Design a protein around this ligand. Sequence first.
Ligand SMILES: CC(C)CN(C[C@@H](O)[C@H](Cc1ccccc1)NC(=O)O[C@H]1CCOC1)S(=O)(=O)c1ccc(N)cc1
Lengths: 99, 99
Amino acid sequence: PQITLWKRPLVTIKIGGQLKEALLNTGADDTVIEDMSLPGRWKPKMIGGIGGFIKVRQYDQIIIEIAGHKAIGTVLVGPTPVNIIGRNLLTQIGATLNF
Amino acid sequence: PQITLWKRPLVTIKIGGQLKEALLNTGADDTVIEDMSLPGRWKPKMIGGIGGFIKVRQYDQIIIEIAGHKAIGTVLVGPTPVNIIGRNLLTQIGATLNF
Ligand SMILES: CC(C)CN(C[C@@H](O)[C@H](Cc1ccccc1)NC(=O)O[C@H]1CCOC1)S(=O)(=O)c1ccc(N)cc1
């Protein structure tokens, strides 16, 4: 699709069998999702946002559907205002910015 | 242009007579620029994301050139670690997400 930006670019994602809402976020390198159970091990990651740096859980090679497109990659889990899909997964679904 | 998301979507902007580098950010409601002086009245605002909140000054009816395109709108100014062009100005230059 072509998504205009008059409203928040919210899409439906599917991860761990659960449907959630997430924001398509070109301003984030990484993908951050609110607390949930994911399979396998995690490793520590520090990420920086507008308020500063926080610690999150990094799960690699997670299967996640994003607006109907399958991606498999790194998902960070931690305290976020909204689930955010970052460039690591936007590139997998073939997303570009155009004007 | 069509901007790939392999790297950060950074562009050159001109605001208040100054050239700056800024992130094209679909995940941001508003535009927020590292602290600088702007003309006219302002009011305080709190904005929050990863790492919590920061206090900023809200200036309305500010003209910015974004990669050569003039747009006008609200600009927030404060201690952001990165210059952010948010949806309120991305819409004005006709920016869309496509996949
Ligand atoms: C958290 C989202 C929902 C909203 N933000 C935009 C996001 O793109 C934000 C932009 C940014 C990048 C680097 C440093 C600081 C900020 N990226 C971000 O945090 O990257 C983290 C998460 C994964 O990778 C690292 S915001 O800055 O908090 C914000 C809030 C309100 C307004 N009016 C404007 C901006």
